[model samples]
Target: VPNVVVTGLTLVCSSAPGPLELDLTGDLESFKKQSFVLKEGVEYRIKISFRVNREIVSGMKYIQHTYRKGVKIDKTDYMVGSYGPRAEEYEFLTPVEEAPKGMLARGSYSIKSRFTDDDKTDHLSWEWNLTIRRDWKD
Candidate 1:
């Protein structure tokens, strides 16, 4: 079993032509009951995807609330970047530290995602969220 906790949360969206960012450093992870043991240092995976008019192309867009330490678009071993068009999927990995690492202590983060399409122009507004937790014993 994993023992983890989540705290404060907020949702922010950039201008009309941008993506939304969701902060899950505080209570959000708890709400999802996310937990992991430090001895094992659990590695969590996240996948976010979206589409435009059910058309899969190179025009979808996305952005993360915080691209800090704890939250990254991939694990140390396997990595996944942002999302693409056509309602495709992108993956990322999050690691829970014994004490609260990454953007959790940053108080706040930017809420914006960048995406483009086959037309080589901006796309729609796609939102995303993330949360993680970890505990260690000596």
Candidate 2:
């Protein structure tokens, strides 16, 4: 049996808008094709919700490789720690990160992301798109 279930991911932004969520529990794989637009210079973070069952899950991490124009630009590794088996969902948020601002930053980017643990297990891997622009809701 799988040791964990990654149920959902949400792009958490401050202010009036509700979070952007991509649900992962179903078999459809529809969410994988979705794209997110981030307003440049705005602070945003990732919210992750998952379930740990059957056994302990240790040293879980969120690793991401970002690309632009098919060229890899940046990679981020966020250590999310461990969790015990529970009936309740485990939820965590990444640190605040700001979208790059100004002319050259306005464009499209894609990311290869992974949810992994110290056991060298990549619990999940997926790709998503992002575009950063000058305004929010523009």
Candidate 3:
């Protein structure tokens, strides 16, 4: 028997029909926060990881951001596999000058992840606060 404990933003499950955990990072490991200031014409890498006691049959994971609150900015879906544990890294360009038409403005924003598991028949989610600025910080 494995003891289970749950807290804010972190959880551990040792048995069947229980909660799980999803870890997030950026260009490094062990980073759990999503707060960031994204600058235009900049490059960045987002990393995601998770583990399970049993094999996962099917699921979808994605990273999305919202600008100025309640406004859709952008989103990217990453494929999750069936296994005990997995990790994925995504890299892309921030933006050019300004946000493209029909998208949220570059300003205070929020980024989050949505995970849907078919094998477990459950959904896991997480979020972070972010900002989109015009200048890059060194």
Candidate 4:
């Protein structure tokens, strides 16, 4: 069976002590109120954990739409490539990215991220909010 299941997602930052976690098995609605705050100026990576099922997948891609207050900011598509079903789960980390910095950039940004393959199968989709602050909001 050709399928993919996303188990978890995380935000790893250059200046943070730990990764901000996103739970996929829990109440999905919880993330609506859960806002991840990243330091205004820092490098970060978005790591996605997934499990492939009974088949091989090609051209795996990560698509994201970042917005601020109903305004579109940046739209990104990361080519994650192919993978084969395995006993152990696998992970992929996006290229290093920088968080917004400045007095005017401190605010909440709503983001929608999704995963898919060349065969047009939707793996997972989720929404989350990320806030920019002068310091880590741990």
How many clashing pairs per prediction, in order? 12, 0, 0, 0
Please state the error at residue 26 of candidate 3 in Å. Answer: 16
* Weakest 10 consecutive residues of candidate 4 by summed lDDT: 24-33
Over all chains combined, what TM-score does candidate 3 have? 0.49
Per-residue accuracy of model 1 over 46-126 as CA lDDT, tens digit each: 333333333334423333443333354332222223233333333333332222344443222122333353454543222
Off by over 4 Å in 3: 1-34, 63-67, 85-105
Error of 3 at 115 (Å): 1.5
Candidate No. with top lDDT: 4
lDDT of 4 by residue, 1-138 (tens): 436889898898767867699987577778977888888888899999999888999999999999999788999999998899888999999999899899899989988888988977778888889989898753
Give the top-scoring candidate (TM-score). Answer: 4
Which of 1 and 4 is the better model by TM-score? 4
Q: Against the true structure, what is each candidate's TM-score? A: 0.28, 0.89, 0.49, 0.93
lDDT of each: 0.30, 0.82, 0.41, 0.87
Sorted on lDDT, best first, the list reads 4, 2, 3, 1
lDDT of 2 at 42: 82
Sort all candidates by TM-score, best to worst: 4, 2, 3, 1
lDDT of 1 at 71: 51
